Amino acid sequence: RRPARCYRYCKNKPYPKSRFCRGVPDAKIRIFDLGRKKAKVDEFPLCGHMVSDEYEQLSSEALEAARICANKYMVKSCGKDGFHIRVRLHPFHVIRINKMLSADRLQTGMRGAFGKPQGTVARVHIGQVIMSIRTKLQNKEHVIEALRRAKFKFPGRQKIHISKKWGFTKFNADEFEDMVAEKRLIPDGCGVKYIPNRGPLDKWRALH
Amino acid sequence: AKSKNHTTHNQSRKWHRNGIKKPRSQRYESLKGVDPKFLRNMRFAKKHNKKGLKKMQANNAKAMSARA
Amino acid sequence: VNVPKTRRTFCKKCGKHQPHKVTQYKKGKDSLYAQGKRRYDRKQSGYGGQTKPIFRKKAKTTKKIVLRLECVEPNCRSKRMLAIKRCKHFELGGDKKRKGQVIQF
């Protein structure tokens, strides 16, 4: 395990797991939701998300350790089924390793300098959301403290923002309680379906 | 003993030492490459132009000098 | 590959498409008292060893198959050559194939 000081800010083209790699090991993270997975939309009002500031690469093992720390603080603060955390970031970039000493000079110089697939990292743009936690109205400070504990574990400098939107949907929390009851938005599990007016009339007949 | 293999550095500056020249002028353009059936048309047409253009163009020149 | 026995190809004597017996071109035995053969024997005779170079590093495994085309028509007897691309196996004139046949290996 090489340190994260040698795998850092972006310098190469994205090299994903595809037909051409064929040698990448499995990533460290596999799951992304840890809280109440089958939660509805009206259960947890607010959400806080974690905004990056530096155009950097985040490793899957750092994502693993951060989601474990955030899950532990959430189950200590608001208990089981009192939160819903989602890691928005997904690792796809595959770094390469040029290992040597396999204490002698007599194995290989820089003869074939192409790297075997070592691990999986994720390129992060400036302003791209790392994690997002939706909770109750009374759990405002606990999301801030959980993302603060994850801030010391992610590299680089990044900020926090409690979103104006109602959870994971792209609609505003002020217009949510005024607009989901009258006409448009119908809950679809944890997601929200937005219906336009350019539909067949049978959908409006099935509604109301 | 590895050396620098290939580059195009310091090439456009050598090109614009002399002001890269279009051929820019061929009055009565080159004729080779054109269709041989069209050449069999054109050569016989030119030599019969040399043969039989005299009297009809002469009378037409007389007619246009009489009119204008 | 496969070529047929007969083929109606343009022969240069009569100027028409006439059928041709197609045979395999023999390489031909070299004749003594040729120009280069007499020169090579005169140059080789004497204490000089091998004078002209002898080829060793052969790399191609196939040869270009060329066909001797003879005019079938009487008293013409025009012969010429037609070259084909390189092939490993070369059937002479038989064993044509068909699509609807069972494999039965």
Binding site: H161 | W15, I20, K22, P23, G33, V34, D35, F38 | -
Partner: protein, 157 residues
């Protein structure tokens, strides 16, 4: 070392873009290609016979020879030494006209009509194509409403 064959960089250039895969239209054929016509070169992946080369795509040439079902075009290609007039035989499907020469002939016909009108009526017409002039001292109008005050908005993430 790039193995310079024929069309080694043409994954996108000799392709039909979108909703155009199929048979060729016949108005590409039904055109008048004579000598001296200034034409453009645009490669087609449908007819794999007489595409010129990957270098001559998008270029513009002059017609010197016309045959049964193709055409001959001279093209000024730039190489390392100097630009060269090169004689290419390109089929009809790869070639369209150029509207720039047609617009120039329209401008020449308009200049001839204005010159005939000038000789008829004694009017100095200024038939030269002047570029975009600087704007004159024009006059504005602001009646009914005061000009709207604008200030930059605060930063909200």
């Amino acid at each position: 070392t790039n193995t310079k064959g024929k069309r080694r960089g043409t994954r996108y250039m000799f392709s039909r873009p979108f909703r155009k895969h199929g048979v060729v239209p016949l108005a590409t054929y039904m055109r008048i290609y004579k000598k001296g016509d200034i034409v453009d070169i645009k490669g087609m992946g449908t007819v794999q016979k007489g595409m010129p080369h990957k270098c001559y795509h998008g270029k513009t040439g002059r017609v010197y020879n016309v045959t049964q079902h193709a055409v001959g075009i001279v093209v000024n290609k730039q190489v390392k030494g100097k630009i060269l007039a090169k004689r290419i035989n390109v089929r009809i499907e790869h070639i369209k006209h150029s509207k720039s020469r047609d617009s120039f002939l329209k401008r020449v016909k308009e200049n001839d009509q204005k010159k005939k009108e000038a000789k008829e009526k004694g009017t100095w017409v200024q038939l030269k194509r002047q570029p975009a002039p600087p704007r004159e001292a024009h006059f504005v109008r602001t009646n009914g409403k005061e000009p709207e005050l604008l200030e930059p908005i605060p930063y909200e993430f």
